[PDB]
């Protein structure tokens, strides 16, 4: 198709006008004093939301250059940083600020490459200082405190979260379930969670949950790749005859088999899902064998054992309690099989760990062992009514994700004051040229933007607030909920340092991309 | 359809405005300091690329004359020069420069034919000087050094590349495969590669690979041409019975048979590919016999032996380990058959080489022998994860192609300084008329364009850099990565001379075409 | 449909504006220094061509009057003169020049019919002088020289061409074939070529060849016309049983039978073609009998012998080696049957020639005898690679056609100098009125136009070149390849007189038509 091509600033400026709107659409929905946005629904009543991620995912500009600039910011900000609600908003606002400053300085006649180098130097120095000043959370008391803080002060949520972390471990797997009671409880069961999400984006069992859900599902495991490979119908024979659903784990599925399964799920909606293998090579084979033993099945590789997908049998396949599949993550719960076989496999893994000496091999064997010997914690969140347990479950999931992010890398002052404590680290850096100095100045100016934005959302003048925070000590910041200079860490206004670091990294990357792009090609309307 | 016809400069000028955009779309993306280009995608997020070939293949102008000028540059530049990423970019930029200078000189009253004569004289002189100054690479340590240089300084990639080129030979066949391990390894197997690509451009099996992939496939060989010839269904009978795929090799396939196969591939996607024959006449018959012996099959020519496509049998056809098909190239790996038969065929080829005396016949028998006695090297590139092994495989393929191009025609200073050393050769040339002198001047001016463009991408002023390189010695050039005048050859900034020569040839050809065209006819909108 | 009608010059001028473009599109592609034309292909890369016939066949104007003028020139120029590449270009350029001069003189108040009479008188005088000036080609040395000259100095092509001509005859039948070897060879086989082309324009077996090709095909012959006559399916029964193709020769095929065969050709593409009978009446019957005896079949006329198309049998029809069908020409090779029957028929034809005395009857019997007693020469052109043998075959065909045209009517100076030697013959002609004198002047001015055009393509000033040629002797002209006044006949710059005469005749005819037309009626848009 015919294309229109724009060079130099005449393109970048256009792209900039496409991000400002997005920034202005999301900059207002950050901080505890976040305002509201009215999303228009073509079919029903307008939605009222105060979530940055939803607002960012909602808008879509009209002009091609503005649209591609907005999409460039959206994709990276939402995908790379998605754990926390402010994680994406901070990324978008910071990226807009850095891009605007860089474009304004470039228009004077500075070198874009040296400006980008100075920006990256300043960002690296800021991140180093942030890693230095990030205090860790490593005690059950501290874990409980951070869980309560991240749960808006709910004591029981923090208590059960800390209990789960203590029972399973910081490296353990925790999920939530409907309690069907008046008091949330904790359970530990046999589980198998790996980091391979669904292969079919259209494969979503639960429309509301953004997730795939099945229970008491049989499982087929084959080392060989089953992409575009037919004759899976024999499995579907018992999948329909026996009411239980089925999960197929392969190297990959694509082509004929994927098209047939996706069409049957779209039209008929049969209950068979498929995903990829967790490991690599011999590690993948061993992990598949471990999973088959944990489920009572067997790997259907043609090598060695004589077993293929051509014929299936009820006791040949494995039995698991329930299968959950989502983005980047999938899990099986309450597997079956011979428990003596489980003990033998665990002892074999233990002896392999003993005999092995390589660090990588020891780590892989440790992961394979801890997948089975350790269990999965399910948080049966309960309450009087379903519409109440749903909100409680959402709050529990939010608190659990926030506390896991906090324990992974530590905590820092919340409310946008985390970055305001890294400005002093910019004096140490020395620039080779003037353009790198200008990049340092740009990052120094943009470090204070989230605090100004939170203050503006709260209504107080941003400049006075940031000046007071900078001139004061390094322990107190500004609380917008109470609107005063308070001791953040004791008052319970903190954020995980992983979120802040990832937001700064994403903003720096996208700003560099938008300030170094030279040619934009867009399809003609 | 109604046509609009433009004569003289009023057409050429239009055509010129077509190429300038293309040049400006690719001139930025050359050099180690290459900027980025944002390709609009109608379905997803915009693509960010710094590859010259992709950017050139992306754009498509709207006006008919500009579009056809851009397509004229695109087709030749991409097709004739495709080995290296900078080859096509250099071709396009040089072609634009020469065409612009030629049009400007022609507009003042010069003779286009006597201008093109001078341009071609200067280009031939420059290429002669380049061939003179091209230092060769013919030692294993030199091959290792050039492989490491072309792999951005990766020592192990260079080591394994040199090991392959030593265990198979400089003129041998090397491919890459997934290692499924933590260390890249080398293997030598029985192979059969010939220079006939796929007959069906819509026969791309692996969508991501731009290639046709099959494993453990039977093979049918027939001397007679099987275009528009039905009754290939009997082969499809066992192709459906035995899940193995099948490859047909004929004189050509076209008409009814091609249409049936292409519709079955588009809709049903059966695993039967077809390709042409490698040889010619007696050579074709002997090569088909050699391939059948290497696979255990037989040529299905009706002459002599009584065998046709009407009836097939499982042991009548040959068996090969894997079939790889791509553009201009195809190969079969791990063939089968009687090894004593292979020995007898090799001995008969040796005796034919002994008895024969003609140079062409001796060369043909040498090629036929080396296609069987020698093996194919597969580089099992491995790593921790699928993405890591994919990126490593891409890097290995890039390094292998670059080092093969280097060994084929030597190496020369990279960074666009290769052509800057050929300007002195333009003093020897003497023009018969003034127009040939003006052509000499045009080529002299355009020789310094790639270096100026690389400097401009790096940000430094082009004129100062090229003047410094011209006035300095003949051993040092400009490094954009470090941004200083350094000794290129030991610093590891080199390019194969084949790429530079092909780029100059293509640019000269397309520039002559665009500066000598008189009538342009384009369909009415 | 509603029609717009234009009278007088207001129409002719419009038509003229539609031929100038065509002339300007083809005038640049003539002479050895022919420039290039960029045809726009709606589906792929633009085509670069330097063929006058292709450019003329490409363009198509938009305005109705201009379009019909261009089509008027195109149809006559291409259809009546298509043997040589310059044969059509010279026709179009000369026709445009004569039409323009005639219209300009008519606008002043001249009488169109007397102007046309003067133009025709001048053209006839020029053609008579040209036929006087022609040098015959009637010796094998001259045949070899002209074959080498027409093959751009290729010695082996000329040698094999002369061998074919002197082995078969001056008016013998020669075709080309793929040699499948490194050396072109000559073969003589039994053949039957007649001057009846394919009946169905859509019937084109070889898409690339502009020809119909079949091998080892049976043949049906019937004296009675088989237009719109069904029950030809009995022949198709064995045409499907035996994979051999089939050719029908009848009086004509039209209506139901033609429609059925053509729809099966586009849809199913069965290998049965049909053509018209060669002769007329008694001659047609005798020629069909000769063809049947040469193929072993029989004519299916119901008179006398009892045989019809209702039932067919394998030995009832004739067997021939291969059937070639093209425009205006069809031919069979390697017929079968009783060789003693062939001898008896030849002796019967000899005795009929002996007894007969009429000149026309003797000529017809001589043609019928020489069809069978003489053979057909096939030139197996060969080479290393298919893309090489294709170009070699094209060059061989071009040289063969050029040398046959040269031997048919002699040769004359090439490079457009042939017509410049006929200007002196215009002094002998005396016009009755002033308008015929003006027509003489018009033809005198237009005789020099091809020389001006060739010089302009070469870039040298046309007027100086033509003045030098006119003032010099009658043996030397201007060579554009070397750009100097050289002795054409020895240097090898000649063209057949047939091409020049036909081009002049066609140009005169079309110019008279475009300068005498009074009313133009064109459908409303």
Swiss-Prot record, chains A, B, C:
Keywords: Acetylation, ATP-binding, Chaperone, Disease variant, Hereditary spastic paraplegia, Host-virus interaction, Isomerase, Isopeptide bond, Leukodystrophy, Mitochondrion, Neurodegeneration, Nucleotide-binding, Phosphoprotein, Transit peptide, Ubl conjugation. The modification N6-succinyllysine is found at residues 6, 57, 100, 108, 166, 177, 180, 193, 211, 225, 276, 327, 371, 456. InterPro entries: Chaperonin_Cpn60_CS, Cpn60/GroEL, Cpn60/GroEL/TCP-1, GroEL-like_apical_dom_sf, GROEL-like_equatorial_sf, TCP-1-like_intermed_sf. It is found in: Mitochondrion matrix. GO terms for cellular component: cell surface; clathrin-coated pit; coated vesicle; cytoplasm; cytosol; early endosome; extracellular exosome; extracellular space. The modification N6-acetyllysine is found at residues 50, 57, 62, 66, 100, 105, 108, 131, 166, 177, 180, 193, 211, 224-225, 244, 267, 289, 327, 334, 364, 371, 444, 456. The keyword Chaperone applies. One of its GO terms (biological process) is response to unfolded protein. Its main location: mitochondrion. It is linked to Spastic paraplegia 13, autosomal dominant: A form of spastic paraplegia, a neurodegenerative disorder characterized by a slow, gradual, progressive weakness and spasticity of the lower limbs. Rate of progression and the severity of symptoms are quite variable. Initial symptoms may include difficulty with balance, weakness and stiffness in the legs, muscle spasms, and dragging the toes when walking. In some forms of the disorder, bladder symptoms (such as incontinence) may appear, or the weakness and stiffness may spread to other parts of the body. NCBIfam families: GroEL, PRK00013.1, PRK12849.1, PRK12850.1, PRK12851.1. This is 60 kDa heat shock protein, mitochondrial. It comes from Homo sapiens (Human). The gene is HSPD1.
């Amino acid at each position: 198709s015919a294309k229109d091509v724009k060079f130099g600033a005449d393109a970048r400026a256009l792209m900039l006008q496409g991000v400002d709107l997005l920034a202005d659409a999301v900059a207002v929905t950050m901080g505890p004093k976040g305002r509201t946005v009215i999303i228009e629904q073509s079919w029903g009543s307008p939605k009222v939301t105060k979530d940055g991620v939803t607002v960012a995912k909602s808008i879509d500009l009209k002009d091609k250059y503005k649209n591609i600039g907005a999409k460039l910011v959206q994709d990276v900000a939402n995908n790379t940083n998605e754990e926390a609600g402010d994680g994406t908003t901070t990324a978008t606002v910071l990226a807009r600020s850095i891009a605007k400053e860089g474009f304004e300085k470039i228009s004077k006649g500075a070198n874009p490459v040296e400006i980008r180098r100075g920006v990256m130097l300043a960002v690296d120095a800021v991140i180093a200082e942030l890693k230095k000043q990030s205090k860790p959370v490593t005690t059950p008391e501290e874990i409980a405190q951070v869980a309560t803080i991240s749960a808006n002060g709910d004591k029981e949520i923090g208590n059960i979260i800390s209990d789960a972390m203590k029972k399973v471990g910081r490296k353990g797997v925790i999920t939530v379930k409907d309690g069907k009671t008046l008091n949330d409880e904790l359970e530990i069961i046999e589980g198998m969670k790996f980091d391979r999400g669904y292969i079919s984006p259209y494969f979503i069992n639960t429309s509301k949950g953004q997730k795939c859900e099945f229970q008491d599902a049989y499982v087929l495991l084959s080392e060989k790749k089953i992409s575009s490979i037919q004759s899976i119908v024999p499995a579907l024979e018992i999948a329909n005859a026996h009411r239980k659903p089925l999960v197929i784990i392969a190297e990959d599925v694509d082509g004929e088999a994927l098209s047939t399964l996706v069409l049957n799920r779209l039209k008929v909606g049969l209950q068979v899902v498929a995903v990829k293998a967790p490991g690599f090579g011999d590690n993948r084979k061993n992990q598949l064998k471990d999973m088959a033993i944990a489920t009572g099945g067997a790997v259907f590789g043609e090598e060695g054992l004589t077993l293929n997908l051509e014929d299936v049998q009820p006791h040949d396949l494995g039995k698991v309690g329930e299968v959950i599949v989502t983005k980047d993550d999938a899990m099986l719960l309450k597997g079956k099989g011979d428990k003596a076989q489980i003990e033998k496999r665990i002892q074999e893994i233990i002896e392999q760990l003993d005999v092995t000496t390589s660090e990588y091999e020891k780590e892989k064997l440790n992961e394979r062992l801890a997948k089975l010997s350790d269990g999965v914690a399910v948080l049966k969140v309960g309450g009087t009514s379903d519409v109440e347990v749903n909100e409680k479950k959402d709050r529990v999931t939010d608190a659990l994700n926030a506390t896991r992010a906090a324990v992974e890398e530590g905590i820092v002052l919340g409310g946008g004051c985390a970055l305001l404590r890294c400005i002093p680290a910019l004096d140490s850096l020395t620039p080779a040229n003037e353009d790198q100095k200008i990049g340092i100045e740009i990052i120094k100016r943009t470090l204070k933007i989230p605090a100004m934005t939170i203050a503006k959302n709260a209504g107080v003048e941003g400049s006075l607030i940031v000046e007071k925070i900078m001139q004061s000590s390094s322990e107190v910041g500004y609380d917008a909920m109470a609107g005063d200079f308070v001791n953040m860490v004791e008052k319970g206004i903190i954020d995980p340092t992983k979120v802040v670091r990832t937001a700064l990294l994403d903003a720096a990357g996208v700003a560099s991309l938008l300030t170094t792009a030279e040619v934009v090609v867009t399809e003609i309307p």
